Amino acid sequence: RFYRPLVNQGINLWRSRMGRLHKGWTTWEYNRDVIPDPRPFPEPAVNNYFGRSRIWNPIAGKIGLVNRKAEEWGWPHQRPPPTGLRRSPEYFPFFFSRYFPDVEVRLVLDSVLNNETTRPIFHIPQDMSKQELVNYLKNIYNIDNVVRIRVRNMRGRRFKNEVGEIKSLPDYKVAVVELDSPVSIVFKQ
Amino acid sequence: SGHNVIKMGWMKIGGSWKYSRSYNDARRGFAKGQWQERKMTPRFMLAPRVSAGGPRNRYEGKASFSRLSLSKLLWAVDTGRLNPNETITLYHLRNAKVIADREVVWPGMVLLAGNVERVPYPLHIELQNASAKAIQLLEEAGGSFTNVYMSHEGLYQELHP
């Protein structure tokens, strides 16, 4: 056995005067060994905020790499492609990009409606720089007259759904292109 | 259903605690690791240490034997738990529930002629250290007593052969 030691009373009470700094705590009582959690308790890693100052978490998570592999190549089952191919523009996600782009250059109509405009406004994904928006309209929509593009970045729209969770849409990038000869749209009522 | 407060009967629950000044103090319990006698030179400290181990101490190897009164053994032999023919070694005494486990320690036992003024039949025993009268009682009735004094290693192999 480990015999109960009588820490609180008796000599073990007075022994603190008899040259004993550290009066041990009873580490045989709580001996159910499952960790407590500190009173300055940590809040979970989920970004609770949904304001316009919502910040991108820079810290790399382990899972996010694993979830990347399982779709890049069947991860637990199919062995990896040799690192030479992965550094190459023939790697499928670099090949599915160089030939099958995935972009959403949506046009706002509230500025290109019946009122003639020389500055039609777009929305382009946050990671379409200016000279790509040129290349895009040039080679996909035949638009050949773009002298200046003017680019913002907007926090995606936010709202509370009828349930109550703040369902913030993705963010985008207003890019007010400036065509030479003005463009317009007709709406017959 | 009540608080047996000292110096005041047995009080009811919800009763008056005007007089439980020392029940709230005899519920904590006796001081632990502390001299019971607060003043007056504890009666233990006043008396002198005797026999550096104690007055009845048992060291490693002491001959302290549990007393098997001869009346018990004679009572059994007629009752029929013990067979008078077979030399009644301590196995028979243990296995016939004459003596239990809680009475056979290392010095095996000791036969004591307790009030037994007579033993009627020739009785044979292999026990440990009979008393001198108990020996001269069996020996008068044509019996024997060959005191086996086995080591502890022998005490086991006799009880669980």
Add this chain to the structure above:
Amino acid sequence: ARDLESHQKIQIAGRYPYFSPDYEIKPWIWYPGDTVEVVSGEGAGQRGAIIAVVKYKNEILVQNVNVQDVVIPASETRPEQVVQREHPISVLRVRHVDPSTNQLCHLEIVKVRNKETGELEERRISLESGALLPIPAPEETVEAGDPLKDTAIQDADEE
């Protein structure tokens, strides 16, 4: 963000209880039109035909039973009307009456080797009459199709 007030926390469970998975019952048994009647709740003994079924929540429009006065909203174009419609009613309180026997039957699935075809399609059968009730086949919409933005099959399956 934070979570809601308790009975409004579970009001979110109370209002949309079909969002938990498997709220849809074990393999479907009730289809449109089948013989049905309500035994519990309201109007015991009201034999009806199942007009329409919404599955994800286990709900059915039992005709001529629980017809709830509909507050139809209309524009300035057409004048609104108040016509009643049979309200989506639960299925846990509706059973089947044998189309032949016309008594409350327990309809459950079976696998039957089909004739001239080997689908072994899961076929509903009563537990008393063995009425082999097949699963009704849905309909491909007649007037579906966009005229100007469809690549023709013969033009889209060119290997």
Add this chain to the structure above:
Amino acid sequence: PKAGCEEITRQGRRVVLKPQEYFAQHRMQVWQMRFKEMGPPFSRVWVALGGKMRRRRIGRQIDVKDMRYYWRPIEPQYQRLYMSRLRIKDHSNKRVQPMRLRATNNDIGQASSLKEWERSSDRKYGAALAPPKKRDFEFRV
């Protein structure tokens, strides 16, 4: 949700079975040497020795230098004090007798006479109070 609604969701230390003491603790040795308890059942004197028997002898009275030699009882006012630490073994059980000062020969085995110890060949029938064990002549550490 009920006991504290937030003190019981976040978790602190959980307590477990509390170890017991040496359940012959209160036959401490300042009696296992000073006194010895004699007597038939229901009368146990804790006879002790004389008070002044080692310190100052020259010149004390001639017939009182020997009142120090008898096994006198200790007055019952102390019998009940010291034997109080022994009664506590199972209180409220009005029919268990107090622990005895010395270990009587039958109770020592009473520990190993329990249905759970019947399989410990060692430490049974008295092995501590046995003579020191004998080992192989080659025994060595």
Add this chain to the structure above:
Amino acid sequence: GFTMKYKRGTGLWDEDHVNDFDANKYLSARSTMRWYYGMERLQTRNNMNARRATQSYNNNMGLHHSGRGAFERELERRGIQVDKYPLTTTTGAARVAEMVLLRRQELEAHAKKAMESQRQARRRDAPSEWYDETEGPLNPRFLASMQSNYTQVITELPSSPVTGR
């Protein structure tokens, strides 16, 4: 620590020497099926647990999954029996208890026919003198169960104590 492990299987049934404080007064229909299935599980859950350990630890020590080293493999190749006491194997017990049941069953039919020898040697078409009730009223339920062993009716008891006829 030490918890009487030499008693786990050494009980006469499956529910014995397993400390289960979690009981109840009335264990219901499926709480009893849950119970009986439970005792055997943690009796076979324990065993195959303890078998996978011994068979795997033995296999990792390079020797046969039941501890049989190179010797006890070489002896069996020679036919020299390597185990002193060959405790009866599963084939044994499942057979040593196969006939005993084959014996009782052939003794029941041997005795089912036997009692009819004596039952039909019971001429009493009317109840014996146990049919008295001067001590206390007969039991109507039982008579209906003893009507078969007679011809005259038995159950019909008057409002008065039975006279005897």
Add this chain to the structure above:
RNA sequence: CGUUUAUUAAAUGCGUCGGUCUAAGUAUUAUAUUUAAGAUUAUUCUUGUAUAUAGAUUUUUAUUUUAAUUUUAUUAGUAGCAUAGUAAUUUAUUAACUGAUUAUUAAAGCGUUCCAUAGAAAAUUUUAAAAUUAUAACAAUCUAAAUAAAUAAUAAAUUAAAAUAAAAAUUUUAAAAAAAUUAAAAAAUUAAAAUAGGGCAAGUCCUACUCUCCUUUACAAAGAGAACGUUUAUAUGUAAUUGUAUGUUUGAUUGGGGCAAUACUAUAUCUAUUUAUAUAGAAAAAG
């Protein structure tokens, strides 16, 4: 002439001076201190720390540290100067517990003293707007009501008053005997207060040194052909952070007796081998 948590003869700061340092910094230098600049001077004498020291302690005083109890010479002295005091004299004021002057044995100032001294704090004289006594003397701004609605505190009140006695207490009660509502002002009482002020008890804290004690890093010995780090032994340092520093009557007493109505607070007196139990050591028979 800067600088500070209860804001200053607080602590800084320059110079001088004492000590230390020529293998990390320039010995008219930089460390380490004591003082305080400027101007006069800086007295007498040593029992301990330090230094030096010779196996160590024990001894031992060039300079330094601390000391001088009748050091007390210079010097100022009733002064932030232990009481004595309002010091005694002089002024000053109608009135001098002010303040300044003379001298001068100041309970034990004293050479780092004393002088010199500027805006400071006093004392006069004197002038002067704050509404300083006399003395009271609303021009100004700070409603009610309507609206919003918090705080201390809250055992109760139908009695609270009032007078008188009390009994432990300040009176508050008890008792006797007496007799007036809502609103706003006042603070006499209720607890108008907070919180300070005591002193006692047990508990803990924190600081200090000749006498208590470790973890202690220094001093010395030894061991390594001593190539340097470690280990010992002997030592125990307030550099050391442990614990004690009482109890009873008020400052002394602690014992066992006795006389004082076979009462005894310590009452009042005295006596004396009236004895000091245990545990380790010491005596090994009974001592």
Add this chain to the structure above:
RNA sequence: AUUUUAUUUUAAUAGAUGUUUAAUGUUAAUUAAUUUAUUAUUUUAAUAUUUAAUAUUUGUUUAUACAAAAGUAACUUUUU
């Protein structure tokens, strides 16, 4: 003076000479009136009062600089 007033008895009760809970209360084998009798004079924690017909509150009139921390309750389409 005497008489006459505050405690010298009875009757009903109801065990007795004052401090350790009464429980088949749906037969913890329940099934339409269980009428649940059991409730801590303070402690915290939540409410509600007193102070409170209130203390605060009260919107009538006008003397220009530009950074960075800091926020992000944040709308968007606007011509960087």
Add this chain to the structure above:
RNA sequence: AAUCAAAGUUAUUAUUAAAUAAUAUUGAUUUUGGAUGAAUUUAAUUUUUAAUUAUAUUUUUGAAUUUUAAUUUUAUUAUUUUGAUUUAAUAUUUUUAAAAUAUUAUAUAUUUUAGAUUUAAAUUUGUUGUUUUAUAUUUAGUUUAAUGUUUAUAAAUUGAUAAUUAAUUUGUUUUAUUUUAAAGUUUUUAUGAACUGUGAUUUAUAGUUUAUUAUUUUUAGUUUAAUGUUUAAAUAUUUAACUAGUGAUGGCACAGUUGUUCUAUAUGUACCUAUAAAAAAUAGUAAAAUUAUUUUAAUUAAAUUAAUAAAUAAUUAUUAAACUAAUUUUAUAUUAAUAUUAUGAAAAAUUUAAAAAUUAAUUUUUU
């Protein structure tokens, strides 16, 4: 003048909690590196996320304690597929929110007025309701086993050897518990130099007296005073004072037996007793409490001792006892066994003492 005693029901919405169960486990809440790596490193013979069937020994004399239990054998770190089982718990919000008796000059609710009054608890160390707590409503609010039925058996003794004519019970082995709330502390490591210290840090946006670059000093944020006193402020309004910084609000730097200190035991994030964290320290030795009416045997005591009260008598208490001359044919609480945190007795009768009460005294001491 004035009273007057009194409203128990919302209505409407559905799959958490807690213990338990002995199967998984490289660090839960985006997508490393994205130059090509050097930057995504936690490892060492100690009660450890490893948790151990005895009462005898032995022991600073006094908080120190028992050795495989069957050698891989099962006491072992655990869930989906019965809203996963079981037993205990039970709600939380939305909006509900109510009611018809007592005088007529004044003590307190009963109808018929008069009679009537500690509010309680503690504290009373009978300095005897001694100046303490309570606004109210409801919820939550404190752990010593009141029991021994057949297998079955115990019981002492020396200092020690031993001895045991020495006389005798009980027990299928009974153990576990020990109040509640409350410190300052105390030790064990994590956070902090945005406030504030000190280190370091800025090389010339107003006025002025003097011959002078030194020096008087404009001086609207700071040695005073008023107001404010839960205040507009957990330091603000008005104001006195002061103000000359080439040597300093400030790059980053020092951290808790310790930093910093022009030193005040001052400050190092709004009480320096640092914060934060982890304990069950002690608190019975005049702190606050300790929950269940109608009952069924009484009382006080006052001595030995105390580096001054947990211990002893005596009392009280729980449980149990047996009828020794004295009397009537009266009348008698005597004890054993255990439980026991106590030093001071109204009115008298007297006795010490300046007592100016304390002290002795000894009969009281209410259901």
